[PDB]
A = this chain, B = another copy of it.
Amino acid sequence: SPSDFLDKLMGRTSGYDARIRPNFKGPPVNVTCNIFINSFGSIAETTMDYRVNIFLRQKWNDPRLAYSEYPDDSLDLDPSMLDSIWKPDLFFANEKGANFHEVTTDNKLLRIFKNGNVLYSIRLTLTLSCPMDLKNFPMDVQTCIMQLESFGYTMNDLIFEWQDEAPVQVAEGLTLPQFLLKEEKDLRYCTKHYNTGKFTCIEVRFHLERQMGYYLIQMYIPSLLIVILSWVSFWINMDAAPARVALGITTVLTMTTQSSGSRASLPKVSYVKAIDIWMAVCLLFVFSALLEYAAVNFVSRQHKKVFIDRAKKIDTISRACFPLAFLIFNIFYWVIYKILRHEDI
C-alpha cells in the first residue's frame, strides 16, 4: 500500500528526523535550483522596488530518502507531510516582504526520485529592491538583481549551484509595462562574508532598457512646440509689443509648469537628469528670447535716426541665429546622450 510506503519511508516509524541535514558531519549537500518567471512589472522608482511571481524550484539528494521497494521511480507527494521532511534553507537577500500562496490548496509540489533525488517546486510572490540610477532618465539601462543565499547553513554544510541548461526561464508572451526585458541574463556568484562566517549565494541579473517613445511623445514634443512658438513670436514686429511680451511670458509659464510636473513625477534624486537638463535648456532659451525682446524694446526708445535701423538689424540677426543654435544644441544633446557617454555596457 502506498500509505504504508509513505509511513515506512519518512514517517515516525522510519526513524528519520527532519531537523538533521543529510550527510551530517560529512560532505556538504549540493543544490541545483532554477526559477521560472511568471509575471513582472510594477517597477516603481519612488519606492525603488519591483515585483516578481517566480516558480522557484529546488533539487538535492539524500541517501536516507532513497527507496527500492515501490516499482515507480517518481511519486508525487503532499505538503502536509512535506512539512515533516528536511527542506534546505533559502531566503532572498534584497527583498522587502514575500509570502506564499494558499488558494484552495497548498502551492507546494514535492517529488521523490528512486535514486534519492528530491524535487521541490514552490510558488512564491516577491517584492525585490534594486537601486536605480537616473544619470539619463529617458534613456537609461537598469540592471535589477535577484540574490539567493542560505541563512542557516555555511559553505561547510550547504552549497548552491545554477542549473546548466535553461536556468532562468521566462513565460512566453511576457511584456513589461514600460521597460523591456532583454534576452541575455547574467548568472554569477555572490558569496558573502558576514560576521558569523561564510555563506553560499546565487545571483541572477535582469537587463531592463527603458522605452523612450512614451516619454518622447509626452514630454519632448511640448518643449519643441513652445520654442517654435517663441520663434513665431520672434518674427513679430516691434509695433505689437504687448502681444510679443504676452507670448513670451506664456511660453515661460508653460515651460516652468511642464518642468515642475516632469520633475515631480519622478523620485527626488540628488544629481541632475537628462530630462532636467533638456527642460532647463529650453527654459533658458525662452528666457533669452524674452530678454533680447526687452533689449530691443529698450533700444527702440534710445533716440533721446539709426537707432530704429539698428534695432531692426539686431532683431533680424537674432531671429536668424537662434534657430540654428537651438538645432545644434539639440543635435549635440541627442548624440551625446545616445552614443557618446550613455547607452554604454
Nearest residue (CB) in B for A267 is: B177
Q: Give, as a whole number of angstroms, the nearest-CB distance from A91 to chain B.
A: 5
- Asked whether A239 is an interface residue with its Cβ less than 8 Å from the other chain, the reply is yes
A63 at the A/B interface (Cβ < 8 Å)? no
Alpha-carbon distance between A123 and B298 when the two chains are bound, in angstroms: 70
A237:B104 contact, CB within 8 angstroms: no
User: CB within 8 Å of B: which of A185-204?
Assistant: 194-196
Q: Is A291 a contact of B232 with CB atoms below 8 Å?
A: yes
Contact A270 B213 (CB under 8 A): yes
Q: Which residue of B lies closest to A213 (CB)?
A: B270
Q: How far is the CA of A43 from the CA of B96 in the complex (A)?
A: 14
The count of residues in chain A whose C-beta lies closer than 8 Å to any C-beta of chain B is: 131
Name 25 interchain pairs, CB-CB below 8 A, sorted by A.
A2-B19, A19-B78, A38-B93, A39-B129, A58-B104, A89-B105, A91-B123, A92-B103, A98-B101, A104-B124, A131-B175, A169-B195, A178-B270, A213-B270, A217-B272, A235-B294, A236-B245, A237-B298, A240-B241, A242-B243, A243-B245, A246-B247, A250-B253, A257-B257, A264-B265
Q: Give A residues with C-beta under 8 Å from B.
A: 2-3, 6, 17, 19-20, 24-25, 34, 36, 38-39, 41-42, 47-48, 51, 53, 55-58, 72, 76-78, 80-81, 87, 89-105, 107-109, 111, 119, 121-126, 129, 131, 151-153, 157, 166, 169, 173, 175, 177-178, 194-196, 211, 213-215, 217-218, 221-222, 225-226, 228-229, 232-233, 235-237, 239-247, 249-254, 256-261, 263-265, 267-272, 276, 280, 283-284, 287, 290-291, 294, 297-298, 300-301
